[PDB]
């Protein structure tokens, strides 16, 4: 549970685990419902989870770039399908012999296993969602790399035009991630790195642009090197914190 870094995930899994392991009171059927209907609903809910899960995985922007990641996701979804099958079977056994304390216990155990598999899927899903953010950091890093290496003023401007948009995109996702982070120190560290990136990139633009125009100018070289180092540190800091590590 201590590896869970998303509050959205944390609350969902807390619901999953607490509710199914803390059943005390029981209730009659809701109006119009049947024992067979309870199993039918469960069956449909398992199916819909699998369908939505498959769609979500197929749309994941790093589907190409990270094949082992997608493989883990399919594996974890498969564990939901499997425990789901056991739940539907033992659940059916229970509702058909609903006074059997022992069949209730077995069905309850099946439920724990299924909702735990759902929780593990969500935890893995968050880690892949984080990899997507890290991929965006890498994109910013490469564009900045190219900007530093550019040999013409026109290239520096065109690359900074790209960088502006990439950093704006990254800024949105990082701010939202910060709001969702469980640990306030990771939150604060992520926001600090965000701020450093926003301050450093415009300075990298103007230091690189001045240096391509005046290469003989040794303070211009120094300033560009210094701002480049600052840029690299901020990007590394974002990646470090997204991965649950301290920056620097």
């Amino acid at each position: 549970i201590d590896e869970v870094r998303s509050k959205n995930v944390l609350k969902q899994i807390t619901q999953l685990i607490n509710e199914v392991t803390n059943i005390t009171e029981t209730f009659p059927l809701k109006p119009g419902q049947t024992t067979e209907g309870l199993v039918a609903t469960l069956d449909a809910a398992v199916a819909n989870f699998l369908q939505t899960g498959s769609f979500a995985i197929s749309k994941c922007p790093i589907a190409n770039s990270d094949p082992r990641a997608i493989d883990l996701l399919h594996e974890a979804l498969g564990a939901v399908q499997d425990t789901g099958q056991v739940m539907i079977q033992t659940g059916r056994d229970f509702v058909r012999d609903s006074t059997s304390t022992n069949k209730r216990a077995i069905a309850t155990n099946s439920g724990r296993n299924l909702l735990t598999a759902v929780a593990k899927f969500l935890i893995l899903a968050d880690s892949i969602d984080v990899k997507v953010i890290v991929d965006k950091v890498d994109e910013v890093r490469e564009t900045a790399h190219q900007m530093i290496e550019a040999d013409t003023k026109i290239k520096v401007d065109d690359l900074y035009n790209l960088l502006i948009s990439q950093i704006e995109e990254l800024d949105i996702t990082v701010r939202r991630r910060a709001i969702d982070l469980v640990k306030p120190n990771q939150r604060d560290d992520l926001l600090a790195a965000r701020s450093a990136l926003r301050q450093t990139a415009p300075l990298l633009y103007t230091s690189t642009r001045t240096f391509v125009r005046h290469p003989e100018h040794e303070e211009a070289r120094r300033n560009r090197d210094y701002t480049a180092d600052e840029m690299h540190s901020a990007l590394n800091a974002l990646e470090s914190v997204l991965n649950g590590q301290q920056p620097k």
Partner: peptide, 27 residues
Amino acid sequence: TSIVEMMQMPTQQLKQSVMDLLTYEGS
């Protein structure tokens, strides 16, 4: 949107359907 975000509603419904079955009092 993200995978976690997309799975919020189906997680709830699956949770709901499991709890509904397990909290059935019997005959």
